[PDB]
């Protein structure tokens, strides 16, 4: 099954740690990288002029469950996410999203599939729009129309 997953971090040097994370999903088993998007840049808000962080868009083959594939994408988020050395207030640096699984819907406590905001968050459809332009949501959205009839920011290549 075709899973795509966000990747964001806002840490440190945001190419080694989203590498790394690469690196990782590729090492889940049963599953392997297909595609994965540029590097996007989304400032922080504010004027203190913080980390910007990096998103990416990954197209992951797996044969996982869907549940099965959210404890990677949580194991690997502990593991190179920092956290251990510093969380909540942090945040935590690195993000892994499970936005779709197949065509699948999953609401459940652990897991919402669509990701529960991704049609709203530019950082998540530019990113997937340059590896999958012709992908439709399960409820039938396209999302190339989405991408003609909602206001994003403004979303700048790293
Ligand atoms: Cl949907
Ligand atoms: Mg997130
Ligand atoms: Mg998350």
Known sequence: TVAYIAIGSNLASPLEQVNAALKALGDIPESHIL?????????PLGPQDQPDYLN?????????????????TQRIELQQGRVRKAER?????????????????????????????????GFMLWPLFEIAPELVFPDGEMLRQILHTRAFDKLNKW
């Open 35 to 43: 595609t994965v998007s540029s590097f996007y840049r989304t400032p």
């Open 89 to 121: 207030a942090g945040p935590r640096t690195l993000d892994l999203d499970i936005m779709l699984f197949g065509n699948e819907v999953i609401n459940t406590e652990r897991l919402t599939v669509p990701h529960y905001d991704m049609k709203n968050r």
């Open 56 to 72: 990416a868009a990954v197209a992951l083959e797996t044969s996982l469950a869907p549940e099965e594939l959210l404890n990677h």
